[PDB]
Amino acid sequence: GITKASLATESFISAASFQETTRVLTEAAVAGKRDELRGLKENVIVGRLIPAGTGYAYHQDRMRRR
Amino acid sequence: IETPITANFREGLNVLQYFISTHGARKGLADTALKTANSGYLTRRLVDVAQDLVVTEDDCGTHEGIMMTPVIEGGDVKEPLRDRVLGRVTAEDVLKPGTAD
Amino acid sequence: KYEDVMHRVVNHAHQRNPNKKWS
Amino acid sequence: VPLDGGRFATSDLNDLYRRVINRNNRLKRLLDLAAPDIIVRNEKRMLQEAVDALLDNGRRGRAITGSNKRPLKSLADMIKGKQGRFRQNLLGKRVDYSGRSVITVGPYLRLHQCGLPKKMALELFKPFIYGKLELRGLATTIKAAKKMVEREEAVVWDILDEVIREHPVLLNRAPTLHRLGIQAFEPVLIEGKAIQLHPLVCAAYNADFDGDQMAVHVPLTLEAQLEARALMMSTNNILSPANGEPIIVPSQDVVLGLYYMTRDCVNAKGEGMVLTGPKEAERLYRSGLASLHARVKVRITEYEKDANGELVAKTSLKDTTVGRAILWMIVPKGLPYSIVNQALGKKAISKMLNTCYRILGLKPTVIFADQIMYTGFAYAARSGASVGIDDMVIPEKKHEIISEAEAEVAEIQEQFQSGLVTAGERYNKVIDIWAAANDRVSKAMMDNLQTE
Amino acid sequence: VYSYTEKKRIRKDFGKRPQVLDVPYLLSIQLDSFQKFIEQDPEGQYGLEAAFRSVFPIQSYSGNSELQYVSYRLGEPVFDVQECQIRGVTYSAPLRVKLRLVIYEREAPEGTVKDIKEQEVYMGEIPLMTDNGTFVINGTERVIVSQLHRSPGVFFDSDKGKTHSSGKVLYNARIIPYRGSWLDFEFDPKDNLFVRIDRRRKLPATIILRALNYTTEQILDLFFEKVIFEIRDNKLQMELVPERLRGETASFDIEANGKVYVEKGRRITARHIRQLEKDDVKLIEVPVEYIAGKVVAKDYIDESTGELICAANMELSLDLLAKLSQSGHKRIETLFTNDLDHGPYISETLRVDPTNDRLSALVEIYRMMRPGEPPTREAAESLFENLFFSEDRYDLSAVGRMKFNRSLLREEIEGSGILSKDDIIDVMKKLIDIRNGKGEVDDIDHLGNRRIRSVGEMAENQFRVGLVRVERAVKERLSLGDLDTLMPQDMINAKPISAAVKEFFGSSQLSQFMDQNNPLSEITHKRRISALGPGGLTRERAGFEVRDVHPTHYGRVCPIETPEGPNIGLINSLSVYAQTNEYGFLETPYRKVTDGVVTDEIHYLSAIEEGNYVIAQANSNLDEEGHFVEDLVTCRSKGESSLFSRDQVDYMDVSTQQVVSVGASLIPFLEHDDANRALMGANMQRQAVPTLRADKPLVGTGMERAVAVDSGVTAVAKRGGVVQYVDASRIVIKVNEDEMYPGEAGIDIYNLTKYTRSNQNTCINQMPCVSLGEPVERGDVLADGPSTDLGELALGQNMRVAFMPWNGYNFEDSILVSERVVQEDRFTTIHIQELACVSRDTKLGPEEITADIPNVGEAALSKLDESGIVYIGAEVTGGDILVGKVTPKDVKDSSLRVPNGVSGTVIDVQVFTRDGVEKDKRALEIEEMQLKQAKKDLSEELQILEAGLFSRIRAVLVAGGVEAEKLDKLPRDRWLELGLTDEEKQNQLEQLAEQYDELKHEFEKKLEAKRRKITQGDDLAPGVLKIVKVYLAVKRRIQPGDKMAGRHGNKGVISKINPIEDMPYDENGTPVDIVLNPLGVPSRMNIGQILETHLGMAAKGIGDKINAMLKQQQEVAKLREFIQRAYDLGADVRQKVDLSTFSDEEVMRLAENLRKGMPIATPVFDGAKEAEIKELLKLGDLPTSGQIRLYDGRTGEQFERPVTVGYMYMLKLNHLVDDKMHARSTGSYSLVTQQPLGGKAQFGGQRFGEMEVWALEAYGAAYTLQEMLTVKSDDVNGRTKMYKNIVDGNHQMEPGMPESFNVLLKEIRSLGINIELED
RNA sequence: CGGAGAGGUA
DNA sequence: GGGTATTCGCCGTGTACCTCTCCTAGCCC
DNA sequence: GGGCTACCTCTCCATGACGGCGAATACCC
Ligand SMILES: [Mg+2]
């Protein structure tokens, strides 16, 4: 379900802005999980360009080089 | 209620009929408040489950796709095929009822 | 000579029901 | 923080760390001096319970403060919930260069613009006006220009008209549901204190002008001015994202003006006279020799573009009314005439804008929508379509139907006193005969309104 | 008949029903409740006497010392009301308590005390109630709203449905005390009776009976009956009353007397019971397996050996029946258990019970209530005795005894406070009976179970809490206190009592800051019935039950007036006629109906007493001495409308206004409105602002007089007479001779309230509405308050309205207003803002209020005097400096400045000074002027009252020893020393002389006392030196953006202010003032505004006809004919006014007050029909349909389809547009997050919140979102670089990282969670 | 320039 | 002991805004 | 009343939400 298919994510910050922050940061804390900042909400948090709209060409030019 | 409101607003409503209509309107407002709350909770969950889905490629090149038909429950045809398949790229060739056309 | 400020701290939530959470 | 009165306030973290440092120092002093075991057991239990009162206080409401035994806030409560950091201060921030007021209509606007008051326009645009005042050379420093807009001199308003002209703003009604909830306009300055919003666009906001308060934002940087103009301009959203139908549907007065304009009565002035074009249909109605709705043969010229993009002109004498001709002056070239020959309520004008967008692209649908709004408000004004108390006609057959239903519930009342029918059969019988009498009264009033 | 002041403007009153009971005084809940709180009550029922007799005598822990109670008393308050609102203190009289300390000797429990001592001690300062019904707490004016919480007593609730998804409905019982510990009986789907205390974990509900000193045999003696088996010949027989066999399937052949009664397989019929009872059958034979399913009742010990054969609550078996068949237990008792009639619940619960005796049960309860510590016998006994059976920690009130006796079908309604054994056991019996199918549950939405607390009861409870804290203080100190070295003011303390009662009145969920902008707003805020607050529900957790209206709110709580939004139906408004009962429930007036005759006596009914009788409807057509003219009448019996017989009813409704509240009985034509727009109409009528010119409603109800009189805003004449003097300041009334006291005779002097600030920054004002030399009657208005005119309530103004869609300027719900309305200054509301400027003692130096200000020139100092405060009446604008003030740093400007965007005139300057700072020159000037005004006020009091007293002496010596020449040779003082007899006349002269000498003494001591009040220093906040307060007074007119609304939920924002020509106009030439939109009528189903529009057109039609009959100045006969025709007009009404009794100025001045329009009433549900409006329009020269052909103002031609015009009464709300408008270029930023501040007052920015971020993600917008949350907020470097770039002209951005994210890394990193950043 | 509560707006 | 129920504990419950009030106890002076 | 010094952990405050979901025992052979 949608309240579970957003917590069980390979990106713990998008699951941290949603329900049960404590459970997500504990499960992400015991595993040493590494969020690649791939998606919209994780990049709205950290303040860079969204990789959807106009900024999608910026993530083309960034994903290409590195 | 087995005794309906037999009078309209152009005529006068008496005390009891207006009282019952007041119960109806308060059920309306109390439905709109709590309904608005659960609605906003629904939009929050939906935009946080989709949340990262970005149209990334021009084509994946697949020969799959669901089969659209007009919906019928037993009454009239509720939604025709034109409204459902308006603007959505075909999976395979649409055959005319003449064979291999 | 201490007048420690932690003895001047405003209880800024002095109207809350004690059973409410997160604050 | 310093409050006023020789008294300070702060967060609850300082109080919780005060408590933890107290338990840790009392544990260092009690284990440094070799206490018996039960005292240091109570000690370590209070320290474990103190840290468990600091990292998350929600699970045990133990940490309490004076005069009101409430749980104190903690670090997990600083992150969690509606008022932590993720939902309160990271996903949505308080944002500068903004403003907010009460909305009002003003239908003289094109739909790519909106009003904006001069006082808010000068307050929102203090940095740009600073830069122009020291660019043209009317001041030396930033504080001289700050005195100039703090004084509101005479030269700053032409500066302000020279920084508005092509710069979008973002209007926003406060419960933003869908992506039309934020749109972008161009300002037109208003002697007033209220944002003048374009009327048709109002239906996208689900707004009504009884005191809604819309907020403006300013796109500062250059790429945001282009994101506002190219993606978010109010002309570049004339279809909903939820469905392919138009969202610039003409809402309430304008469809009454059009519906009054394209109809017919069987006998008014100019009945059965021929008219050489729509132009003298306007010239007949403005004088008063004809009526706005009386049937008339005209010669219209429609341009059906069934070639390879080149428009084919055809002309004829359609049997129509005068109001349909006056409306036909406004419909652009590519549409057929048969879209205006009907009554044109709300559904038919919605598919009118739908076919206009799906045939002639975008710009005739924008300018066709603006012209529909102008003629709809103008001929709605010429209508005078009031409401009076004698306009709602009671059925003359109403009290007869209600008296028959009273006799029928008298019948089922007797059959319940006669012991032949049950309670629930009386229930379904009474609701059925009242529903049937309800529909008889409804068809009586509906006929006696519509065709009387 | 009418008084000389009632004849000023008599409202034409439609209305068919003759009324019987007048409207009661609309503020009776507040005044009766707090009057009930603070008043000397004998026999200790209610008030302070119930608290003092409850907690006292305090007696120590066997210390032979005791503090007993005598009486109490309250002194004068130190301040009067107006000076207390200005200064800021509580309006509170101190509470003096006469305690008495007694101390025994050694070994004298019963003996005489050795020493008594007695004084009048101080405790607390309980705030009084101002005569309007409000409080004053800290300078403001506050209202405590009555709470509607659950009645104490018992409740057998259902909690059906959504438990355990099996359909097996549970049942629960709750014994709710008024004060003490809760008690919840309930079941579980394993059919076991469970208890819990104070919502803790669960206990098996027979363990409390094991705590109440009951054996197992006594428990099963209580909850069950007996089935007797006997040891006999063989196959041990069974006594049998055949009522036990009802509804059973007999698993054996029931036979006796050699006769087969019931064969096996067939149920026991009613005929089988008739055979066994008609044959009188008692004893039959059973199979031995039939008893093997039974449970034995009592114990049966072995007489021979001394052992136990069968224990109580143990099922029987054939071998064990051989174990007791061998010893000789003759009477074998089993408990009759049947799944349909008599349930075996107590037996199952005794099987759940781990405990056996009293002690282990008390160990279980003591361990449950206070967990963790080892239990002890004495702590368990003190705990269980002090949860339910002690006077201290547990008490039902007499109300709780009433519902608790009433809901057990007891007899007496007055009993003890504490519980008993029979209380709990009858609760458990009643709960098992409700489980067994007989009886029914109770509902909590019923107003027979909701009780109204009010100010007196809740203040009594918080004062009670003050007394229990002070009894722990005294029981501490008196246990250690020994001898006569202490007196009973050293023990007792003021801080817990005054801290508790200031904590209640100071701020709670029931001390609302009073919405004081309107007399309707006060008088509907005080009649408010809140369901929130301590002891009741909460906002975000109520459901669809308590928020939804119930069929027993009729006449008690208004159904249509409630706030919308989060609290709907939790902030219920009490009705018009409703009262609070003796116990606290709601009750409502009904008329007693004898068997044929509707008796005109009134007789109140509570909520459950309505549920027994059948009650008629208000608009039942009646006759002469009283017979219902229909042979069947629409009535309600038990919450159900019906059409019952002609003579079956018992009660007729008093009046047809009794269902709505006073917020809703002011909407005319309410019966034509949907309840949505009626609700929003009541709320927006509550929020009107007062205009500058009070203007009567054309279409009223008649409740306007009762609201404008019964609120405290008008100056009601206390004694009728002749007006001696009329001034804007004061009105001086000379009294008639009948209502006049012999001693303290004098006259009356009313000091009106001039321009002072309200609570909502409107301008409360009183203006005289009588002239000099005019008769007045007791109970009439003399000063119209805010929004009042001649004693009516007039909230907004009434204007000429058209209904046509005019060029799109009224698109959704807008309003379009001509330049006529703004030119005539008729929505121009007056606001008053209060600007403080304090003088703080900080670090680095004190603050001066000097004018020596740097960085400013003569534009700042032009509007100040030499002291630095602005003049009275110097018209400031935005940006000017009112109070100069600098803070030493050379020194920094911190002067008070007018907030941006407002104009206005400084009407008043307050100056407060800490005792210890010398005053500047202007403060001595103001103190000088206040001294001169106090001396002039009191001196004019003694001169005018001197003229009344000495003029009364001159009025005495007209007869009875008249000396006309000798009267005014010597002056007015020694007029007693003239020759006169020894009768009541010279005694009366001595009365007046002793009165005047008392006026000398009281004048002098109030003069020096008033100099003591003005002259002395004042208490302030700690750390402030002097406070200068400046009253601006803006005059805000009208502009595009203000909100206006009529009285039917027709909202609207004024959109364009057109010229006078651009309006439509009819062929007579008058332009219409406001053009609405007709499309608000069919969707928002409020057709009532159209009938108000037509009837308003009729009212001004009569107004213009009188105006043509009076500007031409016809003689009074024509006006008498026309006015009499206008007041007769149609069907039979109550009014029936006759103009044969007006003396030709009472016609002419009435017609002076009708020439603007004739005021027409319409009661709520008994109003004008259509036909009366049509005939009244026929009396005018107006068209019948209410529609006029109008000419367009721009184009100058006739509109097709003639439009509706008329006069609608329209209101201006205080949601004006120059409070809503705000903008921010770059201001100040918050401390912990580097985000902009929130709000307008804090000069902050809008919130581009979460859904707006989803809106910009939903576009292709990225850079707009990037600067929308990295540059324009949350980053100091990006916004400084941005500001430099914008003043340069380059448009770019250095994004960086937001600061609050870098705070989030510290609040996760400051847990035990490493959070990082790679590369 | 700190946070709670109460009322109100859409 | 293995699978199945049952109680028990946590998580959540619409956005934006506008006014106002309110912020410390004890005690020996 | 109020100005100076400070809690360096004590008892009944409480009591009207509901759904859902998952984990931690309860129990039945
Ligand atoms: Mg709205």
Numbering used by the authors:
A (entry chain J): 1308 to 1373
B (entry chain J): 755 to 855
C (entry chain N): 87 to 109
D (entry chain J): 253 to 704
E (entry chain I): 2 to 890, 912 to 1341
The article reads:
We used mild glutaraldehyde crosslinking to stabilize the Nun/TEC complex, resulting in high Nun occupancy. The overall resolution of the X-Nun/TEC-20A cryoEM density map was 3.7 Å but local resolution calculations indicate much of the central core of the structure, including the active site, the 9 bp RNA/DNA hybrid, and much of the visible part of Nun, was determined to 3.3–3.6 Å resolution. Nun forms an extended structure that worms its way into the TEC active site cleft, interacting with the β’zipper, then squeezing through the nt-strand DNA track between the β’lid and the β’rudder, then between the β’rudder and the RNA/DNA hybrid. The very C-terminal segment of Nun (residues 102–109) binds in a pre-existing pocket next to the β’rudder between the downstream duplex DNA and the RNA/DNA hybrid. The overall structure of the TEC is largely unchanged, but Nun expands the narrow space between the β’lid, the β’rudder, and the beginning of the upstream duplex DNA by pushing the upstream DNA duplex outwards (away from the RNAP) about 3.5 Å, a full bp step. Nun residue H93 stacks on the exposed downstream face of the nt-strand DNA -10 base while R94 reaches to the major groove edge of the -10 bp, where it forms a hydrogen-bond (H-bond) with the O4 atom of the t-strand -10T.
The 13 kDa Nun protein of coliphage HK022 has one known function, to exclude superinfection by the rival coliphage λ by arresting host Escherichia coli (Eco) RNAP transcription specifically on λ DNA.
